[PDB]
Amino acid sequence: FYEESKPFTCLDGTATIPFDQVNDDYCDCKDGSDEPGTAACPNGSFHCTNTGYKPLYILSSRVNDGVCDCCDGTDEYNSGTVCENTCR
Amino acid sequence: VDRSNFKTCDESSFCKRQRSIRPGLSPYRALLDTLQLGPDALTVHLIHEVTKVLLVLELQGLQKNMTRIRIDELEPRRPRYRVPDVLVADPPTARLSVSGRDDNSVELTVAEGPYKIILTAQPFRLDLLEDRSLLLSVNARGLMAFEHQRAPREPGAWEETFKTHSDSKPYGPTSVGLDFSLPGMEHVYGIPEHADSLRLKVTEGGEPYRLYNLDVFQYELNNPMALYGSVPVLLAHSFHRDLGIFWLNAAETWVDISSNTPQTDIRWMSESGIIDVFLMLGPSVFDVFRQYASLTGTQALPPLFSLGYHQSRWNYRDEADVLEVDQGFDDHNMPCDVIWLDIEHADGKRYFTWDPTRFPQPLNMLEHLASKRRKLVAIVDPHIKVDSGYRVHEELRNHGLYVKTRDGSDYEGWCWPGSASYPDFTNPRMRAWWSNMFSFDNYEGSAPNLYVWNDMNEPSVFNGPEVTMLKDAVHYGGWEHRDIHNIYGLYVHMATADGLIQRSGGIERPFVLSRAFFSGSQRFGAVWTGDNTAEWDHLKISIPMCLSLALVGLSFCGADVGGFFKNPEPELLVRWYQMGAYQPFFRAHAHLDTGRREPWLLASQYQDAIRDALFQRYSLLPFWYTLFYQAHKEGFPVMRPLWVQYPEDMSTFSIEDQFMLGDALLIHPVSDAGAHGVQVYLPGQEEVWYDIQSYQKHHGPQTLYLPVTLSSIPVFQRGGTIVPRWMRVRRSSDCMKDDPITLFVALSPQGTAQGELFLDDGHTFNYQTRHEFLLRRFSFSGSTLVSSSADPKGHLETPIWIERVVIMGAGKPAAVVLQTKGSPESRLSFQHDPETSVLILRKPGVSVASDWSIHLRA
C-alpha cells in the first residue's frame, strides 16, 4: 500500500538514522553529517550560502554562537544576535 | 633575586629583638584579682614581672568552635592599631563560665561544653581543650613579648637604617609576639605568599617565614622570603583533627615553626598593633574553612568569563595587535575570553588614560571585542605620575588624598612613570574617589566589557626600602605605614572591585586581578603568583603556591602560563597550558623582553596539545562555576590538597605534585621535560577512579604509573561524582553559556553518584538580588539518575537542556526511560561499550530547570 522513505546514512557510513535525527541538535554521525545546520557536532561544518557572492564554510561551533560569521548572517538564526548582510 | 635588597630577620631590629627571646619561664603573669567576666568576654590584667607594664587580656569564646585572644596595653601612650575592614561581622560570642578555680588557675567552660579553656596565672598560659583532649597551648614556651610604647623622640630600636634608607621610628620599639603549641600536629600549612612547599618547613636552622607584601624581582624557589601577598592564617592537620590560627595583624610579621608525643610550635612576631588571634578548633578541615569564612568572608563569585582563558603579555602593541590576536584565536580554533592590556596601553603610565598613537579609539576596539563576545582587561596601578597636566594627579593632590611623609608633604617615589605619588587607600574617602573614577563618564574609553588588573599594589616603590614605602610614611587617622602595610593592596583591590560594581549601577559582578593581598582578599576577585620564570621548577611550584592560597580562602589563584621571565621551550609551554587549564585563574603572560608566545606561533603538534587543553577547560566551565559557587556560599576551596579529601591518609599530607578540584577530579599534570609517564597516587579504601580519557577504572589506594604523550593531562574522575560539561566548545564562554549540558556520572562501587550544578546569567548579582539562578542536584542510585532542586529559592529562565549522559561503571540496560512533569514518558536510545562499562544516553532533551528521572531497566 504506502511505500516508506528510506533513512539517512551518514557520509562516513558509521550509522543510519531516521530523518528526524537530521538537524535535530544532537550529533549522531562521527563525521558530523547529520548536523549541517546546527552546532551539535564537534567536527561539523555549516555552509554560508552567501547568495550572489562566494560561499564559505564555517565550524559548526560557530552556528548560533552570537557572532556573525557568514557575510549573509545565516549562521545566526536563533541566537539573539541579528546579523546584517555584509556580503558586498 | 638580589637577597641583599631584602631584610633577613637579623636586619629587621624588631625580629632580632623578638627572636632573641628564647624558650623559658615567661615574665608575664595574670593578676586574677582583676579578672572580670561578662556574657561576651573575660578580661584580666597581665603584668611583666620586670618592667611592671600592665596589659589587658580579652578572652572570648565564640560560636562555631573558635576562641579569640586580644592583648593590648592597659594605659597606652597612644592607641595601638587594630585591623579594620578584614572581618565581615562582629563575631557572634559564646559565654565563658567558671567551672574551676584556685590561687593560680581558672578553668572556663565554653557555653555548655565540650570546649574548655584553662587560664594559668603564673606564668601566664592558656590551654584550649575539647573535653579531655588538649588541642592547643598559648605561651607554653614563654615566648610572649609585648614591647610597650616608651616616651617619644638598643641598636636600631629607635632610628634605623637599611642600605641607604632611614626609618625615623618616632614610637620606637612596639613589637608584639606570642607562641602556640599544637600537640599531635606534625603538618602545618598556609601563611602565603612564599615560593615554597605546601607543607611548611621548620624554621629553626634558618629564617622565619616572612609576611610583608613585597615586589621581589626574579624571586627564587624553596625559601621563606616574603612575596607580594600575606595571609596570616596557619592550618594544622593530623589524622585526628584540624586546627587553624588566624593572627589578625597588618604589620610586618615573622613566623617561626619548630617541632619536637609529636608536636609543632608556632610563634608569630609583629612590628606593631595589638595581639589579636583567632583559634579555629575544627574539628574537621571543612569546619575550619567555615570558621575562617565566618570571620573574613568567602570567595567573590567570579563572572563566568573570568574562569575562561586569558591572553596577556607585556605588551600588546596597539589596536591592530589586539585585533590580530583576537583573530588569531578564531583562525586557529582556540578559545579565549579575555585579551589583556599591560602598562604600554596608557599615556606614559598615567593610569585611566590611553596612548593616542597605539590606542586612538578604545571604544571601537572594545566594540570589536564585544562583537566576538570577548572582554578586555586594562592595568590600573596605585601610583600616580606627579604631573600637573594629569587630572587624576591634580584631583588627588588638591584633595590631599596621597600618602604623606612626617613633615606633611605628599610622599614621592620613583616608579613606572618616574616621580609618582601613592593614593592613601586606607582612607575610606580615597577608596570612594577611586571607585567613582571607574564610572564610564570618568574613565573615558572604558565600556562594560573592560575589566581591571591591579599590579604593584604592595605598594611597589622603585626607589624605596625593599622596593616599598618608607615605614614612617603617614596614613589616614595618623597611622604609620608600618601599622597598615599588609592591607594596602587589599584596599586597592576592594576599591577597584567596588568601582566596577558601581559603574554598572550595582548590577554587574566585578573582575579584578590583584598582585598584593591579605586575609579578606578573596572577597574582591583573583590573585596570581607574580613574576615567575619560564622554568620547569616554577611550573611545579604553581601547585603548592595556589594550594597554600586555597587553604586560607583565596580560591581564585593562578600563575603566569609559560612563566613571566625568559622564553619557555615549546614542550614547557604545552605542559604549562595543561597545568593552567586545571588551575582556577588561567592566564598566559610574559615579560617585555620575551618572544611572542601566542599559542598558534608554535609547530602544529604543540598547537594541537594546547588546543586540547583549552577545550578541556572550556568544557569544564559548568564544573568550575559550580565549585566557585560552593566557595562563595560555604568558603570551601576550589583547588584542594589530597589530604583535604583524605584526612586519615598520612601518605597524602605532603603531596604537592597532584591536587583535586572539589571532590570529583584528581589532577597530576606532567611537569618534567621528556616525561613518558607519571606516578599517580589514587587514594581511598574502597574508592574507584576513572581515567577521564580512556574510561579505565582503578581501585584505590594505589600508585599507578600512567603513560603520557605531549597531549596527555592525567585526570581522574572519582567514583560517586557527577561532573557537568558543555561539550560544544566555542570561541568564548559567552558563546557557550546558554548551551546544553552533558553529565558525566562516575559510579561508586555501590553504584551511586552525586553532583551539583549552579547556573545563572553568567555575570550579574541577579542570583543574590532576584534569586535568579539554578542549583541542581544530580543523584544516581540503584538504577535511577534524578535531577532535583538543591535550592528551591533559585528560579531561572534558560534554554539550557540535558543533551547527553555518560555513565562510567554501568552495565548494558534493556531500556532507558525518562520521566519529567508535563511530558509523556520518554524512551532514550543508548550506546554501551562492554570493555569499559561506559553507557551513553542519547539526547534526554529535558530542561536543566526541571525535576526529572532516568531509569535503567535490565
Ligand SMILES: *[C@@H]1O[C@H](CO)[C@@H](O[C@@H]2O[C@H](CO)[C@@H](O)[C@H](O)[C@H]2NC(C)=O)[C@H](O)[C@H]1NC(C)=O
Ligand atoms: C564543633 O565541635 C564539635 C566537637 O568537636 C563538633 O562535633 C563533633 O563532630 C564530629 C565529626 O567531625 C563527630 O564525630 C562528633 O561526635 C561531634 N561531637 C560533638 C560533641 O558534637 C562540631 O561539628 C563542630 N561544629 C562546627 C560548626 O565546627
Ligand SMILES: CCCCN1C[C@H](O)[C@@H](O)[C@H](O)[C@H]1CO
Ligand atoms: C617593573 C615594572 C612593572 C612590572 N609589572 C609586574 C607585573 O607582575 C607583571 O605581570 C607586569 O607585566 C609588569 C608590567 O606592568
Ligand SMILES: [Ca+2]
Ligand atoms: Ca542528529
Ligand SMILES: [Ca+2]
Ligand atoms: Ca556565528
